[PDB]
Amino acid sequence: SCSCKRNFLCC
């Protein structure tokens, strides 16, 4: 996955 810790809207 992408960085959810950063961009939580990514997931």
PDB file of N, CA and C in Angstrom:
ATOM      1  N   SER A   1       0.839  -1.219   0.000  1.00  0.00           N
ATOM      2  CA  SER A   1       0.000   0.000   0.000  1.00  0.00           C
ATOM      3  C   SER A   1       0.845   1.228   0.000  1.00  0.00           C
ATOM      4  N   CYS A   2       0.252   2.410  -0.242  1.00  0.00           N
ATOM      5  CA  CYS A   2       0.917   3.663  -0.064  1.00  0.00           C
ATOM      6  C   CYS A   2       0.983   4.044   1.376  1.00  0.00           C
ATOM      7  N   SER A   3       1.626   5.184   1.685  1.00  0.00           N
ATOM      8  CA  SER A   3       1.857   5.668   3.011  1.00  0.00           C
ATOM      9  C   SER A   3       0.609   6.164   3.655  1.00  0.00           C
ATOM     10  N   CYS A   4       0.033   5.355   4.561  1.00  0.00           N
ATOM     11  CA  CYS A   4      -1.202   5.652   5.217  1.00  0.00           C
ATOM     12  C   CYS A   4      -0.941   6.479   6.428  1.00  0.00           C
ATOM     13  N   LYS A   5       0.237   6.310   7.054  1.00  0.00           N
ATOM     14  CA  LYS A   5       0.732   7.094   8.143  1.00  0.00           C
ATOM     15  C   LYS A   5       0.859   8.536   7.793  1.00  0.00           C
ATOM     16  N   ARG A   6       1.351   8.855   6.583  1.00  0.00           N
ATOM     17  CA  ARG A   6       1.252  10.148   5.981  1.00  0.00           C
ATOM     18  C   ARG A   6      -0.115  10.432   5.460  1.00  0.00           C
ATOM     19  N   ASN A   7      -0.398   9.997   4.219  1.00  0.00           N
ATOM     20  CA  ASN A   7      -1.628  10.257   3.537  1.00  0.00           C
ATOM     21  C   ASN A   7      -2.647   9.200   3.788  1.00  0.00           C
ATOM     22  N   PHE A   8      -3.450   9.334   4.859  1.00  0.00           N
ATOM     23  CA  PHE A   8      -4.452   8.386   5.237  1.00  0.00           C
ATOM     24  C   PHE A   8      -5.587   8.232   4.285  1.00  0.00           C
ATOM     25  N   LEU A   9      -5.791   9.219   3.393  1.00  0.00           N
ATOM     26  CA  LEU A   9      -6.744   9.179   2.328  1.00  0.00           C
ATOM     27  C   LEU A   9      -6.267   8.390   1.158  1.00  0.00           C
ATOM     28  N   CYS A  10      -5.058   7.805   1.224  1.00  0.00           N
ATOM     29  CA  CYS A  10      -4.474   7.079   0.139  1.00  0.00           C
ATOM     30  C   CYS A  10      -4.989   5.683   0.058  1.00  0.00           C
ATOM     31  N   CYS A  11      -5.488   5.140   1.182  1.00  0.00           N
ATOM     32  CA  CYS A  11      -5.721   3.743   1.377  1.00  0.00           C
ATOM     33  C   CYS A  11      -7.178   3.388   1.115  1.00  0.00           C
TER      34      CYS A  11
END
